[PDB]
C-alpha cells in the first residue's frame, strides 16, 4: 500500500507526503515529515509533544513502524485542495534535553544512574541488554548539563550505546554493549545485491556499494593517580592492529578517570575501539525496507565475495515519497565482527574555577573526618541532600605543610565555609584548597580595628564557648607590639637541650597554686641590686653540705623580742628576753679587752620594726590582693 | 523607481546590481551589495570603512534607507561596458569588533556601561528606549574580549536587545526591552496577504505563510550564594505555561550571577523568556518594502483568522535585483504580545586559571582591609587604574583555618603579591587563595642557605624597620635544631591550669630589670648539687611563721670581722671586735666540761676570705658585664 | 599529455579521472582523487597510508608532481568497463594527528622542539629556511594534544609558517619566517592575464581577477608580569597603518606569554601582522600549471596597472578532469611586500583545574630549593623524566603570609605531594597552591582519634627520625586541652620589653643540668604559704650590702650537734659540744635578771630530727629519682 500516519486526534487525519530521516547508533534519530490533510487547521498544540507513528508495509503483509515524539510541528500555507503540515519526530530521550539539573550520584553504577534518571522523569520504555559488569561509582556529579547530555556522556565513557526498537504504540531504547544485543528483523536476515542495470527489480535489495578505509591511531595509553596507593603503576594501554601502513601511531591521555587498573584498562579499550570503529565503513544504498540502525543483516550477491558478510548498521538515512510509494535508505555499516563503541561527542562539564562549600557532618558531631584528614562538604547548588554525612564524598584538605607523619594540620569543622577546587576542572574530583570567613563565621579579631594583629585561635570541642581557646597572636601596632600565648587547660614546654630566656625589661610571673622547680646540677642566681623574699607560711632551707652567708655590711636575724646583729666592723649585738648557752664539752669566752658581766655595757638592741609577725604577714598578704 | 546607492565620493557613481541582506533583533545586520560603475577604478581605500547607503522607493514617494558602514569592499573583474564592485555593509557597532580591552567597571548599571563604552570610542548614533530599571553592578569586568562581545554579553544577560533605525545620513542603534521601543513604518501598520495563485498583484503584500511550534522548557530555576548573608534563601524560579504536552520540563542553573533575590528573579525571567521566544515562530515571505527587523506590523486577509494579528519582526532576509527592480523579504516574526529576549549566544569570558595581583590601598596606610578581612588588589592587565583603594572591589582572602570568631588570620598588606582565583572562572568574582614571594618581596630567611628553617616572621606597622618584628622559627638542621621566639615589644603567656617546663640541659635566664614572682600557695625548689646566690644590693627574707636553716656539715655566717661558725660535731665559733649579749630576763651559761674566761682558749676564727665587701661586689659585677 | 598516477604496486594501474585540491600556507593540503582501474579489486591495504604521486606535465616537457600520503581510500562499485576508486592525499605532518602525548621540553627553541618531534617519530622530509632567531624556552609543555596540534600552535605563536615542495619521490615541508624562503617555479616567474572576452588562449594564463579589502585592527598591545622584575615595564605595542578610514582601532591582550620585552614585541608583531595579512586579498582564477601555495609569481597584462605585481600564494584551489585534461586553479594572494603570519587557529592546551605533584630533586638531598623559595615537582602525566632535578622548571610555592623579607615560610620537601595550579590555565605556567597528605605521607596526628588537635610538627634534616622534631600543637578536646611546645635541640626566647607569665594552678619546672638566672635590677619573690629549699651540695649566699632575716614565730639554725634557736617571746637557745666566743675589743654579758653559770639552767636543746646529713640528703635525693 503506502505508509500510514497515526497520531492522537486520528489515524485517518494525516497523509504522509514525504519523509526524510536520519538514524545513528547511540544517538537520537530525526524524522522530517512533510504531510497533508483535508483539514486546513489541525491544532498543533493537540499533537505537539505527543507521539506520532509511521506504518510502512513490508513483504508478507507485516508492517515496520517509525515511532517517535513530535518535537516540533508547523502549519504551512497552501491553496484549496490540501493543507500542508510538517512535523519532526524525535525519540523520547530528546525530552531529557528539555530538563537540566545539578545533582550528586553516590555509590551507583552508570547503568543504575541512567535508569534512575529515566525513572525519575517517569520514562519506562527502555531495556537493559548489557552483558559486561559495570563498576560502581563512588562519586558522580551531574553538573550544569541537561539530563540527556549527562546520560549520554556517561554511556560514551563506559562504552555503552543504544538502538531503538519501534512498536506500533511505543518505541524502546535498548541499552547495549555487545553483539548479542543486536538482532535481524524478520525477512531481512539476508538481503541481496542487484546492480541498477536491470530496469525494475521485484524484491527489496541493495543497488550501490562502497567501502572506505582511513588511517587511525593504533593504541591508547592512559594513566592516573590514586593517593591511597601513591606507588602503584596505574598505566594502562590498549592496542588495535591493522595490516596497512602508518597503523602504529600511539595516543596518550591523562587523567584516565579511574582508580583501579581494571577499570582503566576497560576505559582505554573503549576509547580506542571507538576510534577504530571508523577505520572500515561500508555504505549501501538500497530499497531494503526492514533494515534500520542497530539491525544486523547479511549481504549476498556482490561481485567482491569477501564483502558478502554480516553487517551492523551504525547509521541510516531514509527518503520516502508518496504521490496522492517508494522507499530508499542509505546505510552506514561496519563488520559485525568489529565492536562498536561511541565516540566522545557529547561535551563533558567542567568547573571553570573554584567555588565555596560548607563543611558538613553527622547530627551530633562538631568535627567529622577520616584517616587521611578529609572532610565532607555541602555544595550550594545541591538541592537534593540533607546537609549531613551523606552530602558528598570524602574530600582531601590542603594544608600549610604536609610531610611523612609531620607538618601542619587544621581540620575543617562542621559549618565552616571552605574553598573547593576541582582537579582538572572535573566536578567529580573535588579538593579543598582554602578557608574563608563570612558573615556568620567571622574573623577572630575585630576588623579593621585590629588589622595589625596576626594569629591562630582555637576552639574547644565538643561544646566550647568563646572563652575556651588555645591561641598565639602577634600584635604589630608600632610601640604596642605584643605576643600572646593562651593555653586553656595545661601548657607543656619541653626542651631537649639548652633553653634561653632574655627579657629586656621586667618579668612578671604569677602561679596560682604550687610551683616546683628542680635543678639537676648547679643553680646560680645573680641580682645586681635588691633581693626580696616574702613567705606567708613557713620557710625551710635544707643543705646536705655547707651553707654560707656572706655580707659586705651587716647580717640581721630578727624574730619578735629576739634580735641578732652582726656588723662589718666586728660588732656583735644579741638581744632577747632570756638566753641559754650550753655546751657538752668546754666553753671559752675570751676578750682582748675587758669582759664585763652586768656592768650595763650591753643593752637591748633595736629591732627597727622587724620581726613582728603581724607586720610581716601584712607585707605578704599585700602581694596577694583579693579580686 | 529603483534603488539608489549613495556614498562618499558620489551618489551618481555607483549603481546597485543586486543586494542580499540579513537582519536579526539584537544582532548586527549584514548587507551584501553587488554594484556596477562606469569608472573602472574607484579607489577602494576611499570608500572602505566609511558609510554607504541604499535608497529604496516606497509607495507614496517616500523612501526607505539601508545605511551602514563598508566593512569590506571588492573590485571584481568585468566586461567593457560597466565595471563591477562589491561591498558588505554592517552597522557601526561592528567596529567594536575591531577593538579589544581589559577593563574594570565599578558601580554602574549595564546600560550605563554600554553607553560609556560607546561614548569613549566616539560613537553617538544610538538611543535609549529602555522601560525597566536596571541594577547597578558593584564589579563588572571586560576581560580578554572585544568591546562588541562585551556589550553584547551584558545586553543578553539583562534582557536588553537592539534594532536599527535607518535615516538618510545616519543609522541609529535603539536599545530596547519592551514592546514600547518598537514602531510601525508609515503605510505599513497593516499589510495584506494575497495568495500567489492570483497571477499578478499591485500592492505590497505577503504571499506565503508558515507558523511553527516547538517544545520548550517550562521553567528556569536559579541559585547563588551571598557570604554576607550565608543563611539567605536565594533560590528563584520563573515559569511559562503552554497548553501542549511535555511543556513542563524544568531547568536549573548555578550560579545565577546575582546577590539580591529580586535581581535574580529578573535574571530567571529574562533567560526563560528568551528560551520561550522560539516556541511559536511565524514566517512571512513578501514584497513588503517598508517592513524591517524591529518593526511592528499587522497581517490582514489570511485564511486562519487568529493569525491576522500584530507581529514583531525578529529577523529578516532580503533579495533585491536590478536590470541595466524587484524586492523580496522573508520575515521571522513572533506575536507582539509575547516578550522577546536575546539568547545567550555571545561567549562569556572566563579566567582559565589563577593569576597574581598586587594588594593596593590609600596612600598613607600599610594595611587596608574591612570587617570581613578583605583586601583590594591591582591586576596586571588593568591599565585604567591608579593602584589605589579604587583599583578593584573588596576581595576575600583565604586562611589556614577559619571558624566562628576563631581560627587563623594573616591579612595581606599593601604592596604584596597575592594569588587571585576566580569563582567558576568568573572574572567578576575574584577571591584570594595564595601568597607568593618575589624578587622585591623576598623570603624571610636566606635561601637556599636556610632551606632547613621554618617559620612566621612579622613586621611592625606603621613605620617598622627590619629590626621590628615578632616571630617564631624552627631550625631543622640536624644537630643544630632550634626554636626561636621573638616579641619585639611585650610578651604575655597565660595558662589557665598547669604549666610545665622540661629542659634537658642548661637553662639561661636573663632579666634586664625587675623580676617579680608570686606563688599562690607552696613553693618547692630542689638543687641536686650546688646552690649559689649573688646580690649586689640589700637582701631581705621575711617569713610570717617559722624559718628553719639546716645543714649536714657546717653553717657559716661571716660579715667582715664578725665571724660565726656552727659545725656538725657541735663546735660553735664566734669571732668579732666587740660583742654584746643582753637579756631582759635570766641568762644561763652552762658547760658539761670547764668554762674558761680569758684562759686563751678562744681565738679569732678565720673568715677564709669571705665577708669582704669589695670581694663580694666584685663577684656580683662579674655576673653583669658591660656594656 | 595528461595527469599520471604512480603509487605502490604500479603506476600503469591507476588512471586519474578527476581531482580537487586545497592548499594553504602553514596548513596541510588535502587532495581528493577520484580514479578508475581495469582491476576491480586493487586492495586498499597495499596503498593506504602509503605515499601517492600525481604528475601533471608543464610546458617544456617538465613535470609538476602532487606528492602526499593516502589517509583514506574507498572502493566505489562499478559497472563493467572500469572500476572506481577514491583517494585522499594529505602530507606526512598529518600523521602527527594520529599520535598524542604529554611532554615537557626544556631549554630549547620552538624550531628545535619541532625538529625533535619530527626526528623522534622519524620524519626526515623537512627543511629550515628561517631567517630570524628564535628564543630558547625555559619550560614548554605538550599536554593533552596530538603532535600536529602541538607543533602548529608553537609555529603560530612564533609566526613560523610552512609550505610544500614536491619531488617525484618525496614531498618536503619547508619552514619559513620571511619572503626569502619563497621561490618561483621554472617558467612561471611571470604569467600573463587574458580576459575571457578574447575567447580561448592556448598558453598558461589568468582570466579572472578580484581584490578585497576589509577593516582590520590597527594595533595590538600585549602585557605580562615577571616576578623576578616586579617593577619592570613589560607593555609592548605593534602598529600597522592603513590609509583608509576606521583603520586605527586597538587590540589588547594579557598575558602575552613572554618575560622579556623584546620577545613580547615580536609576539605582538607576529599576531598583528597575521590579522593584517587578510586585509588585502587578491584572488585570481587560472589555467597556469606551475603555481602552488608558497610559490612567488608575478602578473602581467591587467588593465589596472598597479596590480601587475609580485604575489605570494597563500592558498590554492584545484580541479582537474579527464576523459579516457583541463586544469584550473583559483588562487588567494597577498602582495609579496607584505609579510604573512599565520592565524592563531590550532587551539591552545588548557589545564581546567589544579593537579597533584610530587616534589623532586637531586639524589642526595632532602630539600631542593632556590633563592625565591621555589621547588621542582614531578607530574603524573610525565613519562619521560627521571623524577630528579631535571623533571620540571622552577615553580613557586604559595605561603600563608608573604611580605618584604618577612612572613611565613614552609618549603616543600622531596617526595611530598603538592597541589599544582596553572596561571591563566597555561600548562607552561604552573605554580603551587596547596599541600596535601596521602597514604604514604600521612597526617601528623592519628585521625580521626585526634581530630581535636591542631598544629605544626617539624622534621630534622638531613637524616631525621620520627623522634627528631620541633613542634607546637593545640589540643582542643574539652576538659583535656593542652598546648605543647617542642624544641628538639636548643630553645631561645627573646623579649625586648616586659614578659608576663600567669599560671592558674601548678607550675612544674625541671632543668637537667645547670640553671643560671640573672636579674638586672631588683628581684622580688612572694609565697603566700610555705617555702622549701633542698640542696644536695653546698649553698652559698653573698650579699654586697645588708642581709636581713625576719620571722614572726621562730628562727632556727641547726647543724648536727650545734643547735641555735631564736623565738618570738625572746628566748635564745644555743646548744653544742663546745663553744668559743672571742672579741678583739671588750665583751659584755648583761642580764636584767640573774646570770647563772653552771647552775644547771641551760641544757642541750632539741634538734627535732633536723641537721642530720643523712636525713637531708635523703630528702634531696627523693626529688631526683633514677630512671
From Swiss-Prot, chains A, B, C:
GO terms for biological process: protein secretion by the type VI secretion system. Keywords: Secreted. It comes from the Bacteria. It is found in: Secreted. InterPro entries: Gp5/Vgr_OB (IPR006531), Gp5_Vgr_C (IPR054030), T6SS_RhsGE_Vgr_subset (IPR017847), T6SS_Vgr_RhsGE (IPR006533), T6SS_VgrG/RHS (IPR050708), Vgr_OB-fold_dom_sf (IPR037026). Disruption phenotype: Deletion of vgrG1a shows residual type VI secretion. However, simultaneous deletion of all three vgrG genes (vgrG1a, vgrG1b and vgrG1c) totally abrogates bacterial killing. Its main location: secreted. GO terms for cellular component: extracellular region; type VI protein secretion system complex. Part of the H1 type VI secretion system (H1-T6SS) specialized secretion system, which delivers several virulence factors in both prokaryotic and eukaryotic cells during infection. Forms the spike at the tip of the elongating tube formed by haemolysin co-regulated protein 1/Hcp1. Allows the delivery of the Tse6 toxin to target cells where it exerts its toxicity. Belongs to the VgrG protein family. NCBIfam families: vgr_GE (TIGR01646), VI_Rhs_Vgr (TIGR03361). Forms homotrimers. Part of the type VI secretion system (T6SS). Interacts with EagT6 and Tse6; these interactions are required for Tse6 loading onto VgrG1. Interacts with Hcp1. This is Type VI secretion system spike protein VgrG1a.
Amino acid at each position: 500500500r503506502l505508509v500510514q500516519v497515526d497520531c492522537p486526534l486520528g489515524p485517518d487525519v494525516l497523509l504522509l507526503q514525504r519523509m526524510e530521516g536520519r538514524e545513528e547508533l547511540g544517538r537520537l534519530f530525526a524524522y522530517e515529515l512533510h504531510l497533508v490533510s483535508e483539514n486546513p487547521n489541525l491544532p498543533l498544540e493537540q499533537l505537539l509533544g505527543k507521539p506520532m507513528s509511521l506504518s510502512l508495509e513490508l513483504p508478507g503483509g507485516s508492517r515496520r513502524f517509525f515511532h517517535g515524539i513530535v518535537a516540533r510541528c508547523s502549519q504551512v500555507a497552501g491553496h484549496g485542495q490540501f493543507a500542508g503540515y510538517q512535523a519532526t519526530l524525535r525519540p523520547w530521550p530528546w525530552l531529557l534535553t528539555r530538563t537540566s539539573d545539578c545533582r550528586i550520584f553516590q555509590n551507583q553504577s552508570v547503568p543504575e544512574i541512567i535508569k534512575q534518571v529515566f525513572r525519575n522523569l517517569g520514562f519506562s520504555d527502555f531495556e537493559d541488554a548489557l552483558t559486561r559488569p559495570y563498576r560502581e561509582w563512588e562519586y558522580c556529579v551531574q553538573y550544569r548539563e541537561t539530563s540527556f547530555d549527562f546520560i549520554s556522556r556517561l554511556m560514551e565513557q563506559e562504552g555503552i550505546y543504544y538502538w531503538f526498537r519501534h512498536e506500533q504504540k511505543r518505541h524502546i531504547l535498548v541499552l547495549s554493549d555487545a553483539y548479542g544485543a543486536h538482532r535481524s528483523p524478520g525477512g531481512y536476515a539476508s538481503v541481496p545485491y542487484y546492480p541498477p542495470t536491470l530496469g525494475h527489480r521485484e524484491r527489496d535489495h541493495f543497488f550501490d556499494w562502497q567501502m572506505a578505509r582511513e588511517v587511525q591511531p593504533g593504541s591508547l595509553t592512559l594513566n592516573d593517580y590514586d593517593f591511597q596507593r601513591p606507588g602503584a603503576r596505574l598505566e594502562v594501554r590498549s592496542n588495535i592492529a591493522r595490516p596497512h601502513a602508518a597503523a602504529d601511531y600511539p595516543l596518550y591521555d591523562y587523567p584516565g578517570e579511574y582508580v583501579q587498573s581494571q577499570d582503566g584498562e576497560q576505559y582505554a579499550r573503549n576509547r580506542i575501539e571507538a576510534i577504530q570503529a571508523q577505520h572500515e565503513r561500508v555504505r549501501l544504498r538500497g530499497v531494503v525496507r526492514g533494515i534500520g540502525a542497530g539491525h544486523l543483516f547479511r549481504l549476498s550477491g556482490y561481485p567482491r565475495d569477501d564483502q558478502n558478510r554480516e553487517y551492523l548498521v551504525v547509521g541510516a538515512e531514509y527518503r520516502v515519497v508518496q504521490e496522492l510509494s517508494q522507499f530508499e535508505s542509505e546505510l552506514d555499516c561496519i563488520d559485525a565482527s568489529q565492536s562498536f563503541r561511541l565516540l566522545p561527542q557529547t561535551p563533558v562539564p567542567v568547573v571553570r574555577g573554584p567555588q565555596t562549600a560548607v563543611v558538613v557532618g553527622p547530627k551530633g558531631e562538631e568535627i567529622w573526618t577520616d584517616q587521611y584528614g578529609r572532610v565532607k562538604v555541602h555544595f550550594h547548588w545541591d538541592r537534593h541532600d540533607q546537609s549531613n554525612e551523606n552530602s558528598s564524598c570524602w574530600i582531601r584538605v590542603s594544608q600549610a605543610w604536609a610531610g611523612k607523619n609531620w607538618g601542619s594540620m587544621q581540620i575543617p569543622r562542621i559549618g565552616q565555609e571552605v574553598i573547593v577546587s576541582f582537579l582538572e576542572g572535573d566536578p567529580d574530583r573535588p579538593i579543598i584548597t582554602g578557608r574563608v570567613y563570612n558573615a556568620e563565621q567571622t574573623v577572630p579579631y575585630e576588623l579593621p580595628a585590629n588589622a595589625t594583629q596576626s594569629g591562630m585561635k582555637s576552639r574547644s570541642s565538643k561544646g566550647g564557648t568563646p572563652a575556651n581557646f588555645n591561641e598565639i597572636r602577634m600584635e604589630d601596632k608600632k610601640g604596642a607590639e605584643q605576643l600572646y600565648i593562651h593555653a586553656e587547660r595545661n601548657q607543656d614546654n619541653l626542651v631537649e637541650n639548652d633553653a634561653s630566656l632574655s627579657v629586656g625589661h621586667d618579668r612578671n610571673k604569677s602561679i596560682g597554686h604550687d610551683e616546683l622547680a628542680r635543678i639537676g646540677n648547679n643553680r646560680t642566681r645573680a641580682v645586681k641590686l635588691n633581693d626580696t623574699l616574702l613567705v606567708g607560711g613557713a620557710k625551710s632551707d635544707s643543705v646536705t653540705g655547707t651553707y654560707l652567708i656572706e655580707a659586705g655590711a651587716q647580717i640581721r636575724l630578727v624574730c619578735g623580742k629576739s634580735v641578732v646583729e652582726f656588723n662589718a666592723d666586728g660588732t656583735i649585738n644579741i638581744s632577747g628576753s632570756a638566753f641559754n648557752l650550753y655546751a657538752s664539752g668546754n666553753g671559752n669566752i675570751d676578750t682582748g679587752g675587758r669582759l664585763d658581766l652586768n656592768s650595763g655595757g650591753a643593752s637591748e638592741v633595736d629591732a627597727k620594726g622587724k620581726g613582728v609577725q603581724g607586720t610581716i604577714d601584712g607585707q605578704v598578704q599585700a602581694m596577694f590582693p583579693p579580686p
